[PDB]
Amino acid sequence: GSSGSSGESYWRSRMIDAVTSDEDKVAPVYKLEEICDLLRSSHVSIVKEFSEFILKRLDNKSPIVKQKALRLIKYAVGKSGSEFRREMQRNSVAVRNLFHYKGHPDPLKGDALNKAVRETAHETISAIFSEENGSGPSSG
């Protein structure tokens, strides 16, 4: 029956990977819901790992893959729990870094696929930092 392996890294990655598949079709709502359940249904360690896999999608050279993550980032935050919110803010540079993501004019679609990424990034920061007011440590 049971047997070891190098680590439970596949379970976590599989979820994010499937909602960030290399397809232009918008990821189905039902798959997003499952992540939002697993997030609260798991310990905060899993929420940290989830965040890492999300970030690894911004690195994918494809424009589409980035956008898929951008919408998930905002769909997930605001429901999955507050832990994912704080951890996502810590690595939010990736989203801001896309406000000017021109990529390359895809010969097929005509610099369209890359808009989507950049567009969603603005909406995504508004979800990570979905805080009207806040606080922070003293400068001295």
Swiss-Prot record:
Bilayer-crossing regions: none
Domain called VHS: residue spans: 19-134
Tissues expressing the protein: Expressed in inflorescence stems, stigmas, roots, roots meristems, embryos, and floral and leaf vasculatures, but absent from the floral abscission zone.
Disruption outcome: Abnormal vacuolar trafficking of soluble cargo proteins, and premature termination of the shoot apical meristem and of floral meristems. Plant missing both AGD5 and MTV1 are severely dwarfed, develop short siliques, exhibit abscission defect, and have altered subcellular distribution of clathrin-coated vesicle (CCV) cargo exported from the trans-Golgi network (TGN).
UniProt-annotated location(s): Golgi apparatus, trans-Golgi network; Cytoplasmic vesicle, Clathrin-coated vesicle
Subunit structure comment from the entry: Binds to clathrin heavy chain.
Role: Mediates clathrin-dependent trafficking of vacuolar cargo from the trans-Golgi network (TGN). Promotes plant growth.
Protein name according to UniProt: Protein MODIFIED TRANSPORT TO THE VACUOLE 1
UniProt source species: Arabidopsis thaliana (Mouse-ear cress)
Range of the intact protein held here: 9 to 135 of 690
